Amino acid sequence: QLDQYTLKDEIGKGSYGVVKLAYNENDNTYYAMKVLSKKKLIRQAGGCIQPRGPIEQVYQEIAILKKLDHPNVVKLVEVLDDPNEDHLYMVFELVNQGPVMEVPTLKPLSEDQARFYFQDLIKGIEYLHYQKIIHRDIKPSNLLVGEDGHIKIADFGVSNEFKGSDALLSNTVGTPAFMAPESLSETRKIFSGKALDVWAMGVTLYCFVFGQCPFMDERIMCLHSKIKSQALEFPDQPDIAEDLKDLITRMLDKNPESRIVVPEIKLHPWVTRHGAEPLPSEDENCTL
Numbered sequence: 001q002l003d004q005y006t007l008k009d010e011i012g013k014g015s016y017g018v019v020k021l022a023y024n025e026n027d028n029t030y031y032a033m034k035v036l037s038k039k040k041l042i043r044q045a046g047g048c049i050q051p052r053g054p055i056e057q058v059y060q061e062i063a064i065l066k067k068l069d070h071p072n073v074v075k076l077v078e079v080l081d082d083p084n085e086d087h088l089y090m091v092f093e094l095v096n097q098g099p100v101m102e103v104p105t106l107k108p109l110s111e112d113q114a115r116f117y118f119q120d121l122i123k124g125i126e127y128l129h130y131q132k133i134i135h136r137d138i139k140p141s142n143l144l145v146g147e148d149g150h151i152k153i154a155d156f157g158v159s160n161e162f163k164g165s166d167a168l169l170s171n172t173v174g175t176p177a178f179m180a181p182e183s184l185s186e187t188r189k190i191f192s193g194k195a196l197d198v199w200a201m202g203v204t205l206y207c208f209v210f211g212q213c214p215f216m217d218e219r220i221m222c223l224h225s226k227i228k229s230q231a232l233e234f235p236d237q238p239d240i241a242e243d244l245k246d247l248i249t250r251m252l253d254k255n256p257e258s259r260i261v262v263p264e265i266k267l268h269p270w271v272t273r274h275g276a277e278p279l280p281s282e283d284e285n286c287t288l
């Protein structure tokens with residue numbers, strides 16, 4: 001159908017475009033293909049005036065993805081781009097089992113299953129931050145489970161690259177239920193990028209064990225208010241360890257300055273099973 005690829009069914013939809021299953025007849029491998037329509041992006045952008053154009057943002061995402069080579073992050077294999085054709089194809093390695101969870105759910109993960117996946121998430125995010133990338137859309141439906149049972153981070157549509165020790169950001173992107181209070185607040189005009197990913201990791205972990213979001217409303221403007229102003233409250237069931245409760249509370253600290261950072265999360269008693277399952281060092285995980 002397309003070069004050496006046989007296109008198959010649509011399997012997911014991220015922030016942009018459609019992901020479909022494809023089969024490469026030359027290497028007998030299945031791939032996931034993100035398909036973008038250039039005219040669609042331009043039409044939908046409309047009269048919007050922005051520093052960066054819609055097609056330009058796509059190229060920035062491609063550049064980000066080309067940097068990444070880690071077992072807990074998706075792998076971009078190829079880009080098929082013809083200036084004459086409307087569609088652009090981003091070919092990724094397939095992660096066979098799909099999203100770890102869709103929220104809400106009546107069947108959440110056990111505490112042990114959540115720890116296993118949360119460890120993968122920590123390693124993948126430590127790597128992204130090491131590579132100077134803020135994901136900005138961490139949520140359970142963007143965490144794909146491989147055939148080997150491990151998580152890979154996907155959907156870099158709203159991600160950005162930063163030059164310094166941290167990213168200094170002023171705009172609000174991603175999924176509303178996972179957005180940090182700082183990003184939504186008019187008082188906080190700029191905010192740390194790393195702390196946004198940690199907040200979203202916190203919402204994600206709460207989702208893992210409870211099958212529901214900490215903050216939710218049908219009206220998005222109310223949801224923003226609850227994120228900023230509603231106290232974190234845990235459900236009665238399942239009854240989780242105080243251990244885990246403490247970690248989630250610190251990740252969902254509404255003040256980004258006192259919020260727990262990734263190097264502290266790595267050593268948290270819940271994550272490590274009190275030192276039984278320690279994570280590798282930053283260098284071992286990122287440049288090894």
Ligand SMILES: CC(C)Cc1cc(-c2c[nH]c3ncc(-c4ccccc4)cc23)ccc1C(=O)O
Binds near residue numbers: 017074
């Ligand atoms: C929400 C998600 C679709 C976002 C996404 C996923 C992938 C992707 C890479 N390798 C994959 N292997 C499996 C699946 C999958 C399988 C079953 C069900 C759903 C997804 C997806 C991928 C690439 C780009 C994007 C994006 O939009 O930027």
